[PDB]
């Protein structure tokens, strides 16, 4: 049984910041890409950031390059997203997700995501 426990969301003014965290249990994050996607009002899912904790290779949405920074602490089995210099367009629900790196055997769940944290950027 996998759990993703999400925290860190809330309401800020432009230029403000939040730190999201996603504490996983039921699997090892070094085995996965772990990251965030976001869904904004009337838009499709978009990858925000991801990290392969086995080597710390990361990827970012073009729209957040230079502002957001993903990291992972493998001893806590937890990933973090530092969101700096927030804008109005960043307003979305952000979901923690993972999928097993490469090929995952069989019929069990290979990719999953959390409940979501709300991030609002207003005023």
């Amino acid at each position: 049984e996998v759990q993703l426990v999400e925290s860190g969301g809330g309401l800020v003014q432009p230029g403000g910041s939040l730190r999201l965290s996603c504490a996983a249990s039921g699997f090892n994050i070094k085995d996965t890409y772990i990251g965030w996607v976001r869904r904004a009002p009337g838009k499709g899912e978009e990858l925000v950031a991801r990290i392969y904790p086995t080597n710390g290779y990361t990827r970012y949405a073009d729209s957040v390059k230079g502002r957001f920074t993903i990291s992972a602490d493998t001893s806590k089995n937890t990933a973090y997203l530092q969101m700096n210099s927030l804008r109005a367009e960043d307003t979305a629900v952000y979901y923690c997700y993972y999928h097993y790196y490469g090929w995952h055997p069989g019929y069990g769940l290979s990719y999953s995501s959390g409940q979501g944290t709300l991030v609002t950027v207003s005023s």
């Binding site: 890409y33 996607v37 499709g44 899912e45 978009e46 990858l47 949405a61 073009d62 729209s63 997700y97 999928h99 097993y100 790196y101 490469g102 090929w103 995952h104 055997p105 069989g106 019929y107 290979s110 990719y111």
Partner: protein, 96 residues
């Protein structure tokens, strides 16, 4: 003979997401003793031209897609599993 109009060629060839057949192993090159079936997957990926040697079409939005893929050790069996890839939701022309 039915000649394709300029504007049509021009709009159709311009930078955008197009169904692209992507070799799996190039995306995930890690267990060299295994082969995948199919060996390639259909992914929306930026393609086309920018009509300026100084610009390249590049994704600016991306999303995950997850598929069932067989893995094969060549004289042993084939087994079903799952793999996840990036598609490109959005493309644009950007300095090289």
């Amino acid at each position: 003979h039915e000649v394709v109009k300029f504007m049509d060629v021009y709009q159709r060839s311009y930078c955008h997401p197009i169904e692209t057949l992507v070799d799996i192993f190039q995306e995930y090159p890690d267990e060299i003793e295994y082969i995948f079936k199919p060996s390639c997957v259909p992914l929306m990926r930026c393609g086309g031209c920018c009509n300026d040697e100084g610009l390249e079409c590049v994704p600016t939005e991306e999303s995950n897609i997850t598929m069932q893929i067989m893995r094969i050790k060549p004289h042993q069996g084939q087994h079903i599993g799952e793999m996840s890839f990036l598609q490109h939701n959005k493309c644009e022309c950007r300095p090289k």
